[PDB]
Write a protein that binds this ligand. Structure first.
Ligand SMILES: *[C@@H]1O[C@H](CO)[C@@H](O[C@@H]2O[C@H](CO)[C@@H](O[C@@H]3O[C@H](CO)[C@@H](O)[C@H](O)[C@@H]3O)[C@H](O)[C@H]2NC(C)=O)[C@H](O)[C@H]1NC(C)=O
Ligand SMILES: *[C@@H]1O[C@H](CO)[C@@H](O)[C@H](O)[C@H]1NC(C)=O
Ligand SMILES: C=C(C[SeH])C(=O)N1CCC[C@H]1C(=O)O
Ligand SMILES: [Cl-]
Ligand SMILES: [Cl-]
Ligand SMILES: [Zn+2]
Length: 574
């Protein structure tokens, strides 16, 4: 009966703690030291963790969730009925694990070598190149090189990963893996919800896109930039053209109101990775949110190790399910871009900390977008000129439009990219897209949503999606599209809670205890209630809505329209 359901839930949570704890360490030992031994150990703890998942998932399914009074118990047991990969037969489960690990190693150890010299790693050698070069051919070298090395080598692994994860999903009662992922939002209208949100941010993006294309035309020359066509994917200052802030100089609305070189200022002033995470820590405490435990500074990996040992460089935050041990792993570089990433990751840690008293089953984000948005909200305030000037990294209507542009190159530009990744991935999981149409359909979406074309035509053998961490790493990506919309909603709520008046882009919530209180009450819920309840606690209303973001950039939209009009731009790509 009911009494048996809660004994079960209590038994699940305590054994899950221990086992999830042993898994995370082994996972961490591999991530921060990629070698054969750590892999072998990670592969072994995988069987263990699966042995545990099966035992408890099998039991959970013997419960009729319908007969259960307590909703909290209802929801845990229902979640425990999802075995994930552990639904797989033992041989396929061991193959599946091997595939993932092989895909992750492949991605993380890949290099792009000059004919007779330097071999370059994605972080930060290729990343730096993408950000800083303005020579069409060097950009192309790195763009194509990364795709030829990480992309192509992921291709051999992907169709079978796809086969196995779909089988896992069908074995857990889903139609395919994407359906399973989407299910994490508990929102049957998810797809239409996101599509409507995407349509709302269009005038803003089409206008950004056209303005940026006009500037690229001006720097790279008419022969390379068609003013009525897609932008070559390699000129946006970022390996994936996902954020465009690194070409700010080429696009600056008013060079007449020049801005400081932040990276100069950071390096010159003895900024360090440690100091960047310490300032993020300080920002969270200014709000009366939790500080990171001493142990965090002992255990984290906040910069690229010097050992000559391979690591997964891509930033991640780690909950050890201890209530005590929390870590970040980042190959942090000293620039403004990674300052923002350090806040993003610190929002993860803060979320682990707020909900650490919940049962581990419910130790997760209200939805995955919420988990991604926390740190970004604070970073919206960090990124203000008034906050940046106080960090000694910066020094007036002109400056205001420059700021919004800077922010727009980061935030608006990512909207179609974050929409596209899982539009392609869902259509792969459900069979619309086969290993023969992988790359072509990836670029039909790059064109449709982002207005990009590949600068080099793609050939059979290319698997460009394999060149983005999340594909080989099998981490869903819609979470980030949801993150970008909602964080603006959170920022607007927190700003009004903090008493601030007038144009929303001028808000800085540093030290606002009222804002900290809203986020905290929301984060403590973990995954115990459906997300609209947290949405409500923060914003006073239950929906996702693009309105705050439209409102944040409204002055920029006006300026972009005027400006694209007078140059006679033709928005979009025919
Ligand atoms: C269904 O079962 C759950 C889980 O056993 C019940 O939720 C739990 O309810 C207790 C008592 O309301 C909560 O404790 C409270 O929270 C804090 C910290 O523990 C404390 O300071 C308060 O004074 C109070 O004791 C507990 O947090 C809560 N647990 C969870 C995971 O939500 C729930 O009440 C049951 N529902 C019904 C309708 O009986
Ligand atoms: C890398 O792995 C080896 C052997 O598996 C281990 O002894 C060593 O501690 C690891 N290196 C670092 C820096 O942790
Ligand atoms: C910060 C992370 C690691 Se959780 C990340 O991967 N981000 C942050 C936003 C989307 C994105 C990306 O790399 O593309
Ligand atoms: Cl690409
Ligand atoms: Cl997600
Ligand atoms: Zn994140």
């Amino acid at each position: 009966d009911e009494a048996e359901a809660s004994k079960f839930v209590e038994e699940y949570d305590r054994t899950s703690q221990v086992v999830w704890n042993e898994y995370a360490e082994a996972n961490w030992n591999y991530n921060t030291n990629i070698t054969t031994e750590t892999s072998k150990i990670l592969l072994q703890k995988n069987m263990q963790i699966a042995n545990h998942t099966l035992k408890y998932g099998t039991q959970a399914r013997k419960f009729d969730v319908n007969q259960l009074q307590n909703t909290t118990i209802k929801r845990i047991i229902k979640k425990v009925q999802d075995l994930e990969r552990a639904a797989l037969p033992a041989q396929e489960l061991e193959e599946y694990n091997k595939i993932l690990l092989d895909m992750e190693t492949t991605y993380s150890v890949a290099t792009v070598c000059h004919p007779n010299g330097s071999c370059l790693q994605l972080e930060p050698d290729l990343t730096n190149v993408m950000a800083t070069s303005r020579k069409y051919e060097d950009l192309l070298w790195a763009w194509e090189g990364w795709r030829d090395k990480a992309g192509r080598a992921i291709l051999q692994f992907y169709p079978k990963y796809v086969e196995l994860i779909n089988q896992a999903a069908r074995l857990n009662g889903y139609v395919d893996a994407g359906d399973s992922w989407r299910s994490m939002y508990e929102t049957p209208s998810l797809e239409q919800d996101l599509e409507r949100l995407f349509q709302e941010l269009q005038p803003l993006y089409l206008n950004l896109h056209a303005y940026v294309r006009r500037a690229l035309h001006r720097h790279y020359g008419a022969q390379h930039i068609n003013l009525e066509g897609p932008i070559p994917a390699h000129l946006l200052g970022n390996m994936w053209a996902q954020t465009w802030s690194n070409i700010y100089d080429l696009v600056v609305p008013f060079p007449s109101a020049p801005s400081m070189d932040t990276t100069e200022a950071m390096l010159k002033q003895g900024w360090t990775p440690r100091r960047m995470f310490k300032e993020a820590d300080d920002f969270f405490t200014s709000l009366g949110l939790l500080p990171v435990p001493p142990e965090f500074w002992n255990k984290s990996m906040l910069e690229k190790p010097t050992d000559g040992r391979e690591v997964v460089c891509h930033a991640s935050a780690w909950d050890f399910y201890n209530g005590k041990d929390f870590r970040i792993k980042q190959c942090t570089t000293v620039n403004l871009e990674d300052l923002v990433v350090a806040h993003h990751e610190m929002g993860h840690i803060q979320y682990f900390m707020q909900y650490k008293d919940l049962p581990v089953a419910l130790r997760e984000g209200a939805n995955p977008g919420f988990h991604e948005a926390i740190g970004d909200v604070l970073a919206l305030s960090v990124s203000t000129p008034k906050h940046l000037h106080s960090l000694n990294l910066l020094s007036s209507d002109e400056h205001d439009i420059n700021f919004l542009m800077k922010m727009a190159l980061d935030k608006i530009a990512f909207i179609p990219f974050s929409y596209l990744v899982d539009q392609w991935r869902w259509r792969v999981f459900d069979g619309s897209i086969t290993k023969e149409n992988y790359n072509q359909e990836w670029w039909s979406l790059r064109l449709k949503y982002q207005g990009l074309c590949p600068p080099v035509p793609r050939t059979q053998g290319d698997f460009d999606p394999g060149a983005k961490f999340h594909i080989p790493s099998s981490v869903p990506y819609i979470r980030y599209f949801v993150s970008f919309i909602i964080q603006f909603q959170f920022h607007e709520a927190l700003c009004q809670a903090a008493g601030h008046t007038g144009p929303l882009h001028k808000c800085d919530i540093y030290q606002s205890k009222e804002a900290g209180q809203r986020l905290a009450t929301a984060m403590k819920l973990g995954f115990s209630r459906p997300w609209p309840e947290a949405m409500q606690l923060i914003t006073g209303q239950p929906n996702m809505s693009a309105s705050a973001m439209l409102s944040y950039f409204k002055p920029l939209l006006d300026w972009l329209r005027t400006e694209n009009e007078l140059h006679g731009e033709k928005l979009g790509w025919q």
